[PDB]
C-alpha cells in the first residue's frame, strides 16, 4: 500500500543556491546530500515532518550532474520547479507489480537505488495525468 | 513556522476522472470534495497520511470552473500536472509576514479560504525558484 507522501522532487539550476533558498525563506535545513551517478543528479533531502506510516516527508532538490539526463532534458525544456512526486511503501516491489497489472507503466523491471539507500521506481507521466511518480521504500523499515 | 507538507496541488481537465484514477490505481479516497468559486476550482482532497505537527498531507486535484482562472490559464498552458505546493503552519499571518519581509511576493495581504475553511496564502513562482508555493493554517487548530 502507498502509505505516505515521501518526497516532492524539484529541478532546480544550481542546487546550492536553492538550497540556501529554501533554508534562508523557511529554516528548512538539509537532511542529507547526495550523488547519484545513474540517475545524473546531485540531490539535497530537506526533512520537513514525520508521517504517521514511521517515515518522513521531504523536499528532494535536484540539479542535474550532466545535460543528457531526465532532470537535464527537462530543466532545458520547463526551466526550475517541480519534477515529481514520490509516495512511500513499506514494498515497492509489490505494489509496483500491482500497478504494473492495472496497465500503468511502470518504468524499471526492478527497483533502483535513490536515496539514502532507499530502492525506487517510476510510473509514467502520462499514464498518471501528467504527474511523474515515484515509489519508494526506505532502506531503514519504519515503525507506524 | 511551517511544521509540515500540507498537500501538492494538482491540475487536471476532468476531476472525476482523475480521483477515479487515483482511487483505482493507488486506493486513496476522496477525504473531501468542494468548489472555490473565488479561486475558480473544483477540488478534491485525498488525504495520504497524518503528520507529526497533529496535521495531515493531502493530494488536492484541481479542475478549472472557468477558463479566466489561475488553473484554467496554466492547464491551457502547460496541460494536466503539478500546479503548486502547500506548507502548513498554525499561523499563516505570521509566517506570511516574516517571508514578506525577505521580498519574497505574497500574493494576499490577508490570507484568503481555502479548503476546508482554511486560510492561504500563495508566495510568487518566480520569487521561489519556480514553485507556486501556498501557506496553509488548517480551521481546525491541531495536537502535535
Ligand atoms: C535519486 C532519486 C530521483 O528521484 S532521481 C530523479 C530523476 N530521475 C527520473 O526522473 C527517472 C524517471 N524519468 C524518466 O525516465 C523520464 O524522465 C521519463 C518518464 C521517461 C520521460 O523521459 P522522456 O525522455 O521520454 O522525456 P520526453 O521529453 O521525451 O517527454 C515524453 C513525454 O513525457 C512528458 N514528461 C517528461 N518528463 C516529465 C515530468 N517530469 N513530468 C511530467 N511529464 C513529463 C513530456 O513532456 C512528454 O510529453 P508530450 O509527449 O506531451 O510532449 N530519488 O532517490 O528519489
Ligand atoms: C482552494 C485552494 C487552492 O489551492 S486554489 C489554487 C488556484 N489558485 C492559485 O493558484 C492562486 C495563486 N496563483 C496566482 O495568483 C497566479 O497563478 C500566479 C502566481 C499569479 C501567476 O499568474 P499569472 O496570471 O501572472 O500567470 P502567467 O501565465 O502570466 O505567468 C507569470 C509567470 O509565472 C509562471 N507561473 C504561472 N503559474 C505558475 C505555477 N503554477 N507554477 C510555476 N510557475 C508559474 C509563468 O510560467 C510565467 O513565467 P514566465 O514569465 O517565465 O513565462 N486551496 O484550498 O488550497
Ligand atoms: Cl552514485
Ligand atoms: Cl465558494
Ligand atoms: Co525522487
Ligand atoms: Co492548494
Ligand atoms: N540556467
Ligand atoms: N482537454
Chains 1, 2 share one sequence.
Not at 546530500?33 to 530537506?46: I, K, S
Not at 492495472?102 to 510510473?123: A, N
Request: overall charge negative; hydrophobic content about 35%; proline content about 3%.
Amino acid at each position: 500500500s502507498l502509505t505516505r507522501i515521501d518526497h516532492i522532487g524539484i529541478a532546480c539550476h544550481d542546487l546550492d543556491a536553492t538550497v540556501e533558498f529554501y533554508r534562508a525563506t523557511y529554516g528548512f535545513e538539509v537532511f542529507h546530500t547526495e550523488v547519484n551517478e545513474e540517475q545524473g543528479v546531485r540531490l539535497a533531502m530537506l526533512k520537513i515532518n514525520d508521517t504517521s506510516d514511521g517515515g518522513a516527508s521531504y523536499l528532494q532538490l535536484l540539479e542535474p550532474t550532466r545535460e543528457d539526463s531526465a532532470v537535464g532534458k527537462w530543466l532545458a525544456k520547463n526551466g526550475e520547479g517541480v519534477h515529481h512526486i514520490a509516495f512511500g511503501t513499506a514494498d515497492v516491489d509489490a505494489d509496483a507489480a500491482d500497478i504494473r497489472d492495472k496497465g500503468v507503466r511502470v518504468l524499471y523491471d526492478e527497483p533502483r537505488r535513490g536515496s539514502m539507500g532507499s530502492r525506487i521506481t517510476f510510473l509514467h507521466p502520462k499514464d498518471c495525468h501528467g504527474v511523474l511518480t515515484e515509489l519508494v521504500t526506505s532502506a531503514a523499515v519504519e515503525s507506524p
